[PDB]
Amino acid sequence: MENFQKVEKIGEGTYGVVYKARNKLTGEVVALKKIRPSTAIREISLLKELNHPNIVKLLDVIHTENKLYLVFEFLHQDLKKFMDASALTGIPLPLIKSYLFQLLQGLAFCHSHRVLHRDLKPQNLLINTEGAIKLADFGLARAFGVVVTLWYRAPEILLGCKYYSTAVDIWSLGCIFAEMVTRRALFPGDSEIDQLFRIFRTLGTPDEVVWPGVTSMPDYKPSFPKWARQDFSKVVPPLDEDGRSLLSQMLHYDPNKRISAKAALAHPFFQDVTKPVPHLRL
Ligand SMILES: Nc1nc(NC2CCCCC2)sc1C(=O)c1cccc([N+](=O)[O-])c1
């Protein structure tokens, strides 16, 4: 309140309440995030340096009265709400393609700077009236270190691996891509084991052939049921073969086999990519 004017609470984020606020000095409207450690302050502050058209800008890190706040650029809609609003007709393919392309650019940028997100989901993908889509919260997970949605969690995380790689973000993005296409979450698990088994029932229970080292993951149990992989054309109909091919590469079990954001940008699926204007009701 000393330095801002609260417009309204807009949601509950991973780390605390998020408000739409107005900077007292500048009059600018921002997304103010209250964080519910000195190591973190220094680390997060470095994120202020990230600047890319597809990344929500971290405007400032404020540490006052022994409270921590992160100030982010404000956008008017998120992908979760946009998908809900578009459920009757579906998001036009050209726009799904444009959003996926832009999201991969944001990931390629962050990953090139050694910054992972680790918790990508429709709620932290923000859109504006000009057709841009941006990712918010990259790098917070590493700096802070932990009802939460498990729908977009990579299998290695669900299997208890405590070492993350850029591949966890590609997995989440693949799940989001599938959801934009079918208008339904790909793997809507209600628990970690349900999340894992939903993945197994669709992509097949992983083994040492497709994922070397999987049987040695922390939470892997030899007792996991063995489900056969489903035909991929049944998972995201009516997406064409270019889209299905790209999606399959984003959903490989072995994180090391998962396509990189950079390589994905070159996939044939983006041969005819454009930047359409979305119809946003604000
Ligand atoms: N920058 C930014 N602009 C936002 N405007 C809202 C978009 C949805 C409609 C209301 C305004 S939301 C936001 C976040 O960064 C954000 C990410 C994860 C979660 C939340 N959250 O509130 O729970 C917020």
Side-chain angles (χ1 to χ4, degrees), residues 8 10-14 16-20 31 33 56 72-78 81 121 123-126 136-137:
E8 58 191 359
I10 53 190
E12 299 294 330
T14 303
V17 186
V18 180
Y19 307 96
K20 174 173 183 176
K33 311 197 181 186
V56 176
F72 278 92
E73 85 173 275
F74 179 86
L75 278 93
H76 286 78
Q77 197 156 295
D78 66 33
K81 299 176 188 293
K121 52 195 160 182
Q123 185 179 22
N124 52 41
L125 288 190
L126 290 297
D137 295 354

Side-chain angles (χ1 to χ4, degrees), residues 53-106:
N54 300 116
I55 294 301
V56 176
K57 177 64 76 168
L58 170 62
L59 301 170
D60 221 327
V61 174
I62 306 172
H63 184 198
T64 54
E65 322 288 4
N66 286 282
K67 301 301 179 54
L68 184 59
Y69 307 85
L70 304 183
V71 184
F72 278 92
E73 85 173 275
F74 179 86
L75 278 93
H76 286 78
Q77 197 156 295
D78 66 33
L79 189 63
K80 178 172 172 48
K81 299 176 188 293
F82 185 64
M83 283 190 294
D84 288 336
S86 309
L88 294 188
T89 178
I91 295 169
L93 181 60
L95 186 60
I96 293 180
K97 185 169 294 193
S98 172
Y99 282 172
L100 182 61
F101 190 67
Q102 294 181 63
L103 290 170
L104 287 167
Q105 292 184 68

Side-chain angles (χ1 to χ4, degrees), residues 32 94 105 154 174 224:
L32 182 64
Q105 292 184 68
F224 287 160

